[PDB]
Amino acid sequence: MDILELSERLDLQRFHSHTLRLYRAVCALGNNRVAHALCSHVDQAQLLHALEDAHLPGPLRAGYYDLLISIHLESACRSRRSMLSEYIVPLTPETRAITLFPPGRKGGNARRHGLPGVGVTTSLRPPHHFSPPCFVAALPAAGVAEAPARLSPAIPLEALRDKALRMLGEAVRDGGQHARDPVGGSVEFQFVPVLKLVSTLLVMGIFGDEDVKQILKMIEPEVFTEELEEGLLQMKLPESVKLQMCNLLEYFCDQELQHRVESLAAFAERYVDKLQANQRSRYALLMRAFTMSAAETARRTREFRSPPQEQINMLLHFKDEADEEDCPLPEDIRQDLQDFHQDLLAHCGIQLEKKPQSLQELVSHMVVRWAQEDYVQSPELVRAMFSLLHRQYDGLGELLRALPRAYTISPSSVEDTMSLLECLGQIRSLLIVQMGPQEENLMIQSIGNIMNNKVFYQHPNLMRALGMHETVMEVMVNVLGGGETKEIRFPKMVTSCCRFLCYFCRISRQNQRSMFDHLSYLLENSGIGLGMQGSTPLDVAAASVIDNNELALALQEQDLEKVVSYLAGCGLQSCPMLLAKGYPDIGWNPCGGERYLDFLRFAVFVNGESVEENANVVVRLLIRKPECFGPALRGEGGSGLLAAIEEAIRISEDPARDGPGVPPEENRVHLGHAIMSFYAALIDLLGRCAPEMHLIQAGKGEALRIRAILRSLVPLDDLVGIISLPLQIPTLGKDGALVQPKMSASFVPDHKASMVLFLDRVYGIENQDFLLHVLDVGFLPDMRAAASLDTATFSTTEMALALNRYLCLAVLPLITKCAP
Amino acid sequence: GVQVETISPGDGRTFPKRGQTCVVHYTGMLEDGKKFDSSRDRNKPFKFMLGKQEVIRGWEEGVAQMSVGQRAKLTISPDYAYGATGHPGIIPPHATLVFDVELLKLE
Amino acid sequence: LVYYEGGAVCTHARSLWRLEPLRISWSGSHLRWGQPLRIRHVTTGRYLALTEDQGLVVVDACKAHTKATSFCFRVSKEKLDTAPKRDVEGMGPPEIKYGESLCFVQHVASGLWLTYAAPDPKALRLGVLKKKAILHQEGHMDDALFLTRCQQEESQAARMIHSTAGLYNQFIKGLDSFSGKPRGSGPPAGPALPIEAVILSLQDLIGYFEPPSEELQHEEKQSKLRSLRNRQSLFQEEGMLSLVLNCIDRLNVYTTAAHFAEYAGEEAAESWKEIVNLLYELLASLIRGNRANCALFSTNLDWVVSKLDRLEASSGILEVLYCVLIESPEVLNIIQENHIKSIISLLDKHGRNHKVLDVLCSLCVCNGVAVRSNQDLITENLLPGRE
Amino acid sequence: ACFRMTPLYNLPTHRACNMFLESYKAAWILTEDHSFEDRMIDDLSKAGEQEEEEEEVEEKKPDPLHQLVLHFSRTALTEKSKLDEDYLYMAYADIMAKSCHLEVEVSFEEKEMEKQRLLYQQSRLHTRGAAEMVLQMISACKGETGAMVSSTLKLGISILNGGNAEVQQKMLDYLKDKKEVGFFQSIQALMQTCSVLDLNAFERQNKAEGLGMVNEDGTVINRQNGEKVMADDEFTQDLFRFLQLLCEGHNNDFQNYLRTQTGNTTTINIIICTVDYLLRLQESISDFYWYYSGKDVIEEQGKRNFSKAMSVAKQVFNSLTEYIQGPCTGNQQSLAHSRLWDAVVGFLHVFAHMMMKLAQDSSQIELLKELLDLQ
């Protein structure tokens, strides 16, 4: 039948409208592949015919318009809108030319505003990418989750914009005539789809200067004539049409803001050039004339010695006219800035006929007139109109809030910046959709490309302005949250999520601070990520706190308590994943305990010195929850540390106790090594928490407390025994086959190193008898073993390397200190 | 399964050569008669180079047997077509494909 | 068993209790110190009692014989007990106040005091917030209790829950009694089912859970929605929803009204269909707008898809599915091809109904998040056929 | 590094341009004073074409400002787990609060003219339904601190300044008809969250500033960190000023409502909550006294923290005084049987010892003056 019979066949109209809704849903939010598939069922010719068809029911008309937008324009519009909020200005002659006001004789204040959306924009927005629809092409042999992401189907955008403008003008004239047969059966059905398409095309950037002028004249000719027709504003339209008009005006106001930002950047380029030249000349003159007067030269050179930011501040500190004299700058340089400031205030309307003559006045009058004329029943329209009114009444504030998102780059970084922007757009798109194999691969690829990009390292401030770390963060946590109890999927994604963030913290201290701000958010998600091997949110937190005394002192008691609670849970409960894998069931989780313990280490001990503020807190919390120490050191019915280590070695020897023993990864956990490493990390943390000596000499009672408590917790005899414990040594046997101990399943020197750190920091070596005792029992044997393994066959053995690291790190410095 | 029928004759003497781009208009129909693709709807001729495996075998062989200015119907078995995997959404598995191809010019 | 517990139990019905003075007349009088009274659990109908074998428990009314269930509120734990009391006609003096007064519960006959069991260590490892309640002559200082008022809505809902649970369990009882026993050419040979009572209860509950009208003003709609969510949560936490599902299962075992009659008779066969439709409607009302109640179905989604094909309550089952899929993304993450194909088969067999299209649309996106798996499955298994 | 600090003329143009952007933003844009609040409020208050209609006034169609207030009230009343941050709400609340005040012997006439003007500006809002919106947002915040609740409290203070009996009555009537416990629950939670002096934070900040860390990029000496100690002092003062203003003028009805809410299922005693906060503040101040007791001279950071604490305590004392003035006998009895006396004892201890200590150094005379005013 003719689709036009659906005007009377209502059930069919409903079913087809909901079919179009389903078409939009399946292609919604980035499914460009589904969009391509749909292009077969609903073709470009069908869609374009429906756009013009005046006899379609409004539901079908709107559905087809929205389907076109969804298939072709939705992804690009969303990607571009995500970027519009950010302003990255390349320093280019085009940028330099930009001015707030177009050239003219009329005075700065009076100067008639240029038409919004008509001008030169240098802000960086990545291009749109489309792929032609074809269904005879060869099928890619690459499997799912390996094939590259598909682009949106292409449609002729210039013809589409021309058609849209023409149809909008036709709608305007028809509304002026006030006919009784509106397209679609109502003014809403007539106008709303066209306005939606026009707004999409504007945001996408398809419209040119002349097209923008035509749109402006359709809106209100009188105001927007540069140098009868009735405009949509006076066409006395319903609320939905008003909402669409509000969105259009929001676009135009955003463009005005963008113009302001770009003009400010251009003036910054020129004024910085002038200031740089003047500063050079003044420094030269000073280096010429310092000989006459040596006293004032000091105050003069304060400028050239101060940080550049402070130099700029001082140079600009002449607004109030009370402190202008101190500023070295001349009156011409000062007056250029003053003039630009006045011009900006005029552009924003601050500086002091019935007809608006300006977009701000037009928008304010429109909103007030609408509200006066009727009580709006659309909360969305209310929100939009009052937002526009606020923007018009506060132009300076909007610019002030946009400035943080503004960054100037050299023209030689544009290509890398654009690639980074494309990757960031991909990542941002990945937020809305649920994570899958494909999305994980794309995310990993984007992270890798960003890391390869130099700009990432060169411009961390730009990264923070772009909000990249928060986006990565949100993706990771969203992925974790889903079914976190069952299993933590996409561990590769999470590992990438550090490599990005857990390096981003190292790039800059400000980046480290930014990530520190989210510490609590990371910790609550960190609990489940214990099993998942690799870089974790706990590592994110450790990177946020590592080597920054400022951040460590900022660290919070509540976060420490959360960590200690997780550690107590580990100390009292076994790991369900290991139980499922069939490991022998012990009562506690040494691996997670060790993770938390090393985090607390990074928190308390910084740059070689302990932070007593955090250390005392950790000690108090741990002693309040003694389960964190482990089943050993429990007190009543508790074995000693040495006994625990011996039992761990026994387990390591005996299979069916170290593991199920019934591994492609080769990273399978060995329980003996896990226990020994847990205890070693605990002892290391306690030793680091141990007070620095100068406090002890000072006599600080708190320090004496902490030291006595640590001594009570860990007896010295046990440390000496652990240090004395033998270590398996590589040997050649059975035809000279090299027999080498596995480290992941055996006692290792770093375990002894932790004990040595504890001994040095808490107990100390002050008496020759104890010195000789320790050296004869534990140290000298190990040094002899290292020397014996210093042979061609054995010298490169990982065991020998670990022994040498242990020696150089712990023993040799200690003997050097105790030499007297 | 490439089977070519002549709807309208061409020159009969000039035929596509490897490395020579073929420009066509086409309408794609499944054997049951349902249309799934048409270049004329987009109003843009489809260009493809022979021997680069860009298009399915069905096309590779049919256009080669065809001549400039020729209009033909090509019936392609699934094996020469997308096959058991099919084209998700567009083409079902194990589908014979019927095409109406007009070979505009060679470049 | 009786516990001191904190959390959502505070807002739940099972935390609610009713105080019943031993006198019928002037039982709504002000409570006064020393007054013997019974303490009833609204949702179960059971009375707090002291049993020698099990100590403090809640027993049935048939075993509630005053001596076990008689309790008093005293301001102080001192053994004054000087004078037995004297009945007073009228409301009496206003002694005990809500929120302010601190009361100690004492079993009159024994004289024991209500107190916590002093949980042993490792209960923290259990993570239990529950402290068992016992009757101990010494007690503790913190044994005092604050009395807090309950909303009329909550009281009504708890009593509703008790009555509805009793009725539905009796119904399930009759169904199980004649489950495997055909009536043959005779009577069903069992107690008559409460068909009319079930029907009336279902209708009243549907009206009770009916969502507010759109014409109502925004504030009133918000208040009604808040009340409705609260009532839904109370019913779910007391297990009504599982009872509805169980009734639906036992009614579903029978394909048609004649099949039902073979076991229960024509008289119940007539109302079979009405009851199943009412049950599905009640389930939809209970879960509508409540994300948690809709998420509960993530475990047993097949429960709905398997029943979609049934003809008696196709619309009701479809509405249940629609509500679940709107409210919960957890279900959307567990959707499978089997489910998508079942819904497509529902289109094929039942006709072109826009509600199924709406359900499929909901399968794709929830709360601004799209499921590519569901999108692709729908596209692959609906579009290409083109029928 | 300080010697090496590159002269401005040696930097790349783009980095210098960024630095200029920030410096210009701080010095010129941020310092600029543009006032549009009153103009905006008037333009939104004016109603148009009702004069020609002659029926619209009787219809009582909302004017634009009324519609905006209603929109925000709708947002607040919408059922949600949490209150989403709305920058539009915060901006418009700030605009209204600024418009309400809009502000060495003053004539009685001039003083009364300022009072009458302030009353007119407050009427502009509470006639349009701003008080109920304030209460609704306070209930919606559900005890979570933030810019939204801060702006709501500032708006309430602005409309209540001078003890507006009309606003007081409107608020009390709304609360009593709605019978919602969320308002006082949120108030109680906010009181519990309100902070006191923390010596651990004091010491941590002292060590941080002593470290003299410099920003690795360029150089930022003695970079000022966020003030951990009394970060929410302004919020605390605003909360207690709001509660005080609600009772200002010896409003017996609201005074007693604060103590007890008869209609509601549950009751919260804001007076006792205030006493508890005062006790916590007293403990903090006594600890900080003991911390500085050995030290001969308090340093500047301490002198601060003292001044901030004494300002908060002054506001708390004024609020408690306003709860009872009139007098409200029930509130008097509640305080008498509360823990207030212990707080007074501790404050007296601190007052005596700080007076003796601060008298020794003249530089501490300002702190001494503030302490005496607090006494």
PDB file of N, CA, C and O in Angstrom, chain A residues 276 280 283 305 313 316 319 341 371-373 376 383 386 393-394 408 509-510 550 553 612-614, chain D residues 5 8-9 11 14 18 23-24 28 32 34 43 46 61 67 86 92 204 207-208 213 215-216 225:
ATOM      1  N   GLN A 276      57.795  40.367  26.009  1.00  0.00           N
ATOM      2  CA  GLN A 276      59.072  39.676  25.906  1.00  0.00           C
ATOM      3  C   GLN A 276      60.137  40.600  25.337  1.00  0.00           C
ATOM      4  O   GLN A 276      61.258  40.671  25.858  1.00  0.00           O
ATOM      5  N   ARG A 280      63.428  41.888  27.419  1.00  0.00           N
ATOM      6  CA  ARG A 280      64.779  41.719  26.894  1.00  0.00           C
ATOM      7  C   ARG A 280      65.519  43.050  26.861  1.00  0.00           C
ATOM      8  O   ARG A 280      66.666  43.154  27.319  1.00  0.00           O
ATOM      9  N   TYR A 283      66.361  44.273  30.398  1.00  0.00           N
ATOM     10  CA  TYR A 283      67.461  43.510  30.975  1.00  0.00           C
ATOM     11  C   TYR A 283      68.792  43.932  30.371  1.00  0.00           C
ATOM     12  O   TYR A 283      69.797  44.046  31.081  1.00  0.00           O
ATOM     13  N   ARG A 305      64.785  37.340  38.402  1.00  0.00           N
ATOM     14  CA  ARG A 305      65.040  36.168  39.220  1.00  0.00           C
ATOM     15  C   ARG A 305      63.721  35.497  39.595  1.00  0.00           C
ATOM     16  O   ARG A 305      63.665  34.311  39.795  1.00  0.00           O
ATOM     17  N   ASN A 313      52.695  38.247  36.554  1.00  0.00           N
ATOM     18  CA  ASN A 313      51.785  38.839  37.526  1.00  0.00           C
ATOM     19  C   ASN A 313      52.201  40.262  37.872  1.00  0.00           C
ATOM     20  O   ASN A 313      51.383  41.188  37.858  1.00  0.00           O
ATOM     21  N   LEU A 316      51.618  42.652  35.006  1.00  0.00           N
ATOM     22  CA  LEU A 316      50.207  42.938  34.790  1.00  0.00           C
ATOM     23  C   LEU A 316      49.570  43.690  35.951  1.00  0.00           C
ATOM     24  O   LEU A 316      48.455  44.197  35.807  1.00  0.00           O
ATOM     25  N   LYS A 319      46.334  47.517  37.332  1.00  0.00           N
ATOM     26  CA  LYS A 319      44.943  47.871  37.067  1.00  0.00           C
ATOM     27  C   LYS A 319      44.469  49.011  37.964  1.00  0.00           C
ATOM     28  O   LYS A 319      43.848  49.966  37.485  1.00  0.00           O
ATOM     29  N   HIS A 341      40.703  45.176  27.477  1.00  0.00           N
ATOM     30  CA  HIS A 341      39.803  44.864  28.580  1.00  0.00           C
ATOM     31  C   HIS A 341      38.479  45.600  28.424  1.00  0.00           C
ATOM     32  O   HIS A 341      37.402  45.024  28.621  1.00  0.00           O
ATOM     33  N   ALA A 371       7.692  33.805  29.298  1.00  0.00           N
ATOM     34  CA  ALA A 371       7.211  33.537  30.647  1.00  0.00           C
ATOM     35  C   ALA A 371       6.043  34.444  31.005  1.00  0.00           C
ATOM     36  O   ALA A 371       5.086  34.011  31.657  1.00  0.00           O
ATOM     37  N   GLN A 372       6.103  35.710  30.589  1.00  0.00           N
ATOM     38  CA  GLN A 372       4.999  36.629  30.832  1.00  0.00           C
ATOM     39  C   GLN A 372       3.741  36.176  30.108  1.00  0.00           C
ATOM     40  O   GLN A 372       2.633  36.274  30.646  1.00  0.00           O
ATOM     41  N   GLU A 373       3.896  35.680  28.881  1.00  0.00           N
ATOM     42  CA  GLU A 373       2.741  35.333  28.066  1.00  0.00           C
ATOM     43  C   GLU A 373       2.062  34.076  28.577  1.00  0.00           C
ATOM     44  O   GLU A 373       0.832  33.959  28.513  1.00  0.00           O
ATOM     45  N   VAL A 376       4.782  28.240  31.629  1.00  0.00           N
ATOM     46  CA  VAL A 376       5.349  27.096  30.932  1.00  0.00           C
ATOM     47  C   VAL A 376       5.130  25.831  31.745  1.00  0.00           C
ATOM     48  O   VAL A 376       5.398  25.786  32.954  1.00  0.00           O
ATOM     49  N   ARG A 383      14.168  25.099  32.252  1.00  0.00           N
ATOM     50  CA  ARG A 383      15.599  25.006  32.510  1.00  0.00           C
ATOM     51  C   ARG A 383      16.396  25.673  31.399  1.00  0.00           C
ATOM     52  O   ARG A 383      17.288  26.485  31.661  1.00  0.00           O
ATOM     53  N   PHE A 386      15.939  29.597  31.226  1.00  0.00           N
ATOM     54  CA  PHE A 386      16.565  30.319  32.325  1.00  0.00           C
ATOM     55  C   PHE A 386      18.083  30.186  32.277  1.00  0.00           C
ATOM     56  O   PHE A 386      18.806  31.103  32.684  1.00  0.00           O
ATOM     57  N   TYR A 393      22.901  37.441  31.099  1.00  0.00           N
ATOM     58  CA  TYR A 393      23.144  38.402  32.166  1.00  0.00           C
ATOM     59  C   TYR A 393      24.548  38.298  32.747  1.00  0.00           C
ATOM     60  O   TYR A 393      25.025  39.266  33.349  1.00  0.00           O
ATOM     61  N   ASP A 394      25.219  37.152  32.580  1.00  0.00           N
ATOM     62  CA  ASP A 394      26.562  36.941  33.104  1.00  0.00           C
ATOM     63  C   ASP A 394      27.460  36.414  31.983  1.00  0.00           C
ATOM     64  O   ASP A 394      27.617  35.212  31.777  1.00  0.00           O
ATOM     65  N   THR A 408      46.783  27.071  24.955  1.00  0.00           N
ATOM     66  CA  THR A 408      47.444  27.528  23.741  1.00  0.00           C
ATOM     67  C   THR A 408      48.581  26.580  23.403  1.00  0.00           C
ATOM     68  O   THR A 408      49.387  26.234  24.274  1.00  0.00           O
ATOM     69  N   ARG A 509      53.714  16.201  39.576  1.00  0.00           N
ATOM     70  CA  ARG A 509      53.181  16.203  40.932  1.00  0.00           C
ATOM     71  C   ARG A 509      51.749  16.719  40.963  1.00  0.00           C
ATOM     72  O   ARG A 509      50.936  16.248  41.765  1.00  0.00           O
ATOM     73  N   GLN A 510      51.425  17.685  40.101  1.00  0.00           N
ATOM     74  CA  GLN A 510      50.050  18.163  40.010  1.00  0.00           C
ATOM     75  C   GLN A 510      49.117  17.055  39.547  1.00  0.00           C
ATOM     76  O   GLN A 510      48.002  16.917  40.062  1.00  0.00           O
ATOM     77  N   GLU A 550      53.872  16.196  50.870  1.00  0.00           N
ATOM     78  CA  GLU A 550      52.650  16.986  50.938  1.00  0.00           C
ATOM     79  C   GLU A 550      51.424  16.085  50.920  1.00  0.00           C
ATOM     80  O   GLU A 550      50.560  16.163  51.805  1.00  0.00           O
ATOM     81  N   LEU A 553      51.129  13.763  54.060  1.00  0.00           N
ATOM     82  CA  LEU A 553      50.580  14.478  55.203  1.00  0.00           C
ATOM     83  C   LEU A 553      49.103  14.783  55.004  1.00  0.00           C
ATOM     84  O   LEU A 553      48.339  14.808  55.975  1.00  0.00           O
ATOM     85  N   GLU A 612      55.997  10.276  60.819  1.00  0.00           N
ATOM     86  CA  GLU A 612      55.520   9.789  62.107  1.00  0.00           C
ATOM     87  C   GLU A 612      54.013   9.952  62.237  1.00  0.00           C
ATOM     88  O   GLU A 612      53.344   9.124  62.866  1.00  0.00           O
ATOM     89  N   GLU A 613      53.453  10.997  61.624  1.00  0.00           N
ATOM     90  CA  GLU A 613      52.017  11.230  61.731  1.00  0.00           C
ATOM     91  C   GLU A 613      51.229  10.034  61.217  1.00  0.00           C
ATOM     92  O   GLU A 613      50.288   9.571  61.875  1.00  0.00           O
ATOM     93  N   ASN A 614      51.595   9.518  60.044  1.00  0.00           N
ATOM     94  CA  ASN A 614      50.909   8.352  59.499  1.00  0.00           C
ATOM     95  C   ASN A 614      51.363   7.066  60.179  1.00  0.00           C
ATOM     96  O   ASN A 614      50.564   6.137  60.352  1.00  0.00           O
TER      97      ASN A 614
ATOM     98  N   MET D   5      66.257  30.479  37.015  1.00  0.00           N
ATOM     99  CA  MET D   5      64.892  30.777  36.600  1.00  0.00           C
ATOM    100  C   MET D   5      64.886  31.597  35.327  1.00  0.00           C
ATOM    101  O   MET D   5      65.360  32.737  35.301  1.00  0.00           O
ATOM    102  N   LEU D   8      61.491  35.775  31.284  1.00  0.00           N
ATOM    103  CA  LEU D   8      60.273  35.605  30.504  1.00  0.00           C
ATOM    104  C   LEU D   8      60.557  35.559  29.011  1.00  0.00           C
ATOM    105  O   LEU D   8      59.939  34.770  28.285  1.00  0.00           O
ATOM    106  N   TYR D   9      61.489  36.385  28.529  1.00  0.00           N
ATOM    107  CA  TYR D   9      61.694  36.494  27.090  1.00  0.00           C
ATOM    108  C   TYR D   9      62.270  35.221  26.482  1.00  0.00           C
ATOM    109  O   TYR D   9      62.258  35.077  25.254  1.00  0.00           O
ATOM    110  N   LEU D  11      61.093  32.121  27.163  1.00  0.00           N
ATOM    111  CA  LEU D  11      60.126  31.039  27.157  1.00  0.00           C
ATOM    112  C   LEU D  11      59.469  30.897  25.786  1.00  0.00           C
ATOM    113  O   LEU D  11      59.438  31.847  24.999  1.00  0.00           O
ATOM    114  N   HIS D  14      53.741  29.953  23.555  1.00  0.00           N
ATOM    115  CA  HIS D  14      52.471  29.364  23.972  1.00  0.00           C
ATOM    116  C   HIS D  14      52.396  29.200  25.489  1.00  0.00           C
ATOM    117  O   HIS D  14      51.358  29.473  26.103  1.00  0.00           O
ATOM    118  N   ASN D  18      49.764  31.021  27.985  1.00  0.00           N
ATOM    119  CA  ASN D  18      48.949  30.388  29.008  1.00  0.00           C
ATOM    120  C   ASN D  18      49.112  31.125  30.324  1.00  0.00           C
ATOM    121  O   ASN D  18      48.129  31.653  30.860  1.00  0.00           O
ATOM    122  N   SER D  23      47.125  34.821  34.669  1.00  0.00           N
ATOM    123  CA  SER D  23      47.386  36.029  35.446  1.00  0.00           C
ATOM    124  C   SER D  23      46.348  37.108  35.160  1.00  0.00           C
ATOM    125  O   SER D  23      45.858  37.773  36.079  1.00  0.00           O
ATOM    126  N   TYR D  24      46.017  37.306  33.884  1.00  0.00           N
ATOM    127  CA  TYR D  24      44.974  38.251  33.504  1.00  0.00           C
ATOM    128  C   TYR D  24      43.638  37.849  34.105  1.00  0.00           C
ATOM    129  O   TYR D  24      42.893  38.688  34.621  1.00  0.00           O
ATOM    130  N   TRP D  28      42.367  40.771  36.535  1.00  0.00           N
ATOM    131  CA  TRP D  28      41.448  41.675  35.856  1.00  0.00           C
ATOM    132  C   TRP D  28      40.022  41.138  35.829  1.00  0.00           C
ATOM    133  O   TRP D  28      39.099  41.808  36.298  1.00  0.00           O
ATOM    134  N   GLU D  32      37.111  42.212  38.643  1.00  0.00           N
ATOM    135  CA  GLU D  32      36.095  43.114  38.125  1.00  0.00           C
ATOM    136  C   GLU D  32      34.786  42.924  38.881  1.00  0.00           C
ATOM    137  O   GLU D  32      34.417  41.805  39.247  1.00  0.00           O
ATOM    138  N   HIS D  34      30.902  43.457  38.536  1.00  0.00           N
ATOM    139  CA  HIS D  34      29.704  43.687  37.745  1.00  0.00           C
ATOM    140  C   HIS D  34      28.504  43.184  38.532  1.00  0.00           C
ATOM    141  O   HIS D  34      28.490  42.034  38.984  1.00  0.00           O
ATOM    142  N   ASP D  43      13.593  42.473  36.428  1.00  0.00           N
ATOM    143  CA  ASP D  43      13.101  42.078  35.114  1.00  0.00           C
ATOM    144  C   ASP D  43      12.269  40.808  35.191  1.00  0.00           C
ATOM    145  O   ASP D  43      11.301  40.657  34.437  1.00  0.00           O
ATOM    146  N   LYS D  46       8.718  41.761  37.046  1.00  0.00           N
ATOM    147  CA  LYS D  46       7.728  42.490  36.266  1.00  0.00           C
ATOM    148  C   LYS D  46       6.894  41.537  35.419  1.00  0.00           C
ATOM    149  O   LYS D  46       7.415  40.600  34.807  1.00  0.00           O
ATOM    150  N   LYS D  61      -1.596  34.186  37.281  1.00  0.00           N
ATOM    151  CA  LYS D  61      -0.584  33.454  36.541  1.00  0.00           C
ATOM    152  C   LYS D  61       0.795  33.742  37.128  1.00  0.00           C
ATOM    153  O   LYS D  61       1.124  34.903  37.403  1.00  0.00           O
ATOM    154  N   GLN D  67       7.812  31.274  38.454  1.00  0.00           N
ATOM    155  CA  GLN D  67       7.977  30.024  37.723  1.00  0.00           C
ATOM    156  C   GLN D  67       9.337  29.403  38.004  1.00  0.00           C
ATOM    157  O   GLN D  67       9.456  28.180  38.113  1.00  0.00           O
ATOM    158  N   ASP D  86      23.222  21.130  40.909  1.00  0.00           N
ATOM    159  CA  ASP D  86      22.645  21.937  39.840  1.00  0.00           C
ATOM    160  C   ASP D  86      23.272  23.326  39.888  1.00  0.00           C
ATOM    161  O   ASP D  86      22.909  24.159  40.731  1.00  0.00           O
ATOM    162  N   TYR D  92      21.309  30.871  40.675  1.00  0.00           N
ATOM    163  CA  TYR D  92      20.105  31.668  40.871  1.00  0.00           C
ATOM    164  C   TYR D  92      19.847  31.924  42.351  1.00  0.00           C
ATOM    165  O   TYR D  92      19.377  33.004  42.732  1.00  0.00           O
ATOM    166  N   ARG D 204      50.178  18.448  60.897  1.00  0.00           N
ATOM    167  CA  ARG D 204      50.487  18.034  59.535  1.00  0.00           C
ATOM    168  C   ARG D 204      50.697  19.243  58.636  1.00  0.00           C
ATOM    169  O   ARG D 204      51.661  19.293  57.862  1.00  0.00           O
ATOM    170  N   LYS D 207      54.089  20.956  59.506  1.00  0.00           N
ATOM    171  CA  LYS D 207      55.222  20.288  58.874  1.00  0.00           C
ATOM    172  C   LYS D 207      55.227  20.522  57.369  1.00  0.00           C
ATOM    173  O   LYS D 207      56.291  20.715  56.766  1.00  0.00           O
ATOM    174  N   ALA D 208      54.049  20.498  56.746  1.00  0.00           N
ATOM    175  CA  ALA D 208      53.967  20.716  55.307  1.00  0.00           C
ATOM    176  C   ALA D 208      54.524  22.081  54.927  1.00  0.00           C
ATOM    177  O   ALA D 208      55.338  22.199  54.003  1.00  0.00           O
ATOM    178  N   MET D 213      58.160  23.043  50.333  1.00  0.00           N
ATOM    179  CA  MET D 213      58.171  22.403  49.026  1.00  0.00           C
ATOM    180  C   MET D 213      57.857  23.424  47.941  1.00  0.00           C
ATOM    181  O   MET D 213      57.050  24.337  48.134  1.00  0.00           O
ATOM    182  N   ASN D 215      56.873  23.941  43.743  1.00  0.00           N
ATOM    183  CA  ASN D 215      56.331  23.275  42.568  1.00  0.00           C
ATOM    184  C   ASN D 215      57.437  22.993  41.562  1.00  0.00           C
ATOM    185  O   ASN D 215      58.208  23.884  41.197  1.00  0.00           O
ATOM    186  N   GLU D 216      57.504  21.738  41.110  1.00  0.00           N
ATOM    187  CA  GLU D 216      58.570  21.336  40.199  1.00  0.00           C
ATOM    188  C   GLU D 216      58.491  22.104  38.887  1.00  0.00           C
ATOM    189  O   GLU D 216      59.514  22.558  38.361  1.00  0.00           O
ATOM    190  N   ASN D 225      48.234  25.159  50.720  1.00  0.00           N
ATOM    191  CA  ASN D 225      47.342  24.024  50.575  1.00  0.00           C
ATOM    192  C   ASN D 225      45.945  24.383  51.062  1.00  0.00           C
ATOM    193  O   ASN D 225      45.728  25.405  51.721  1.00  0.00           O
TER     194      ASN D 225
END
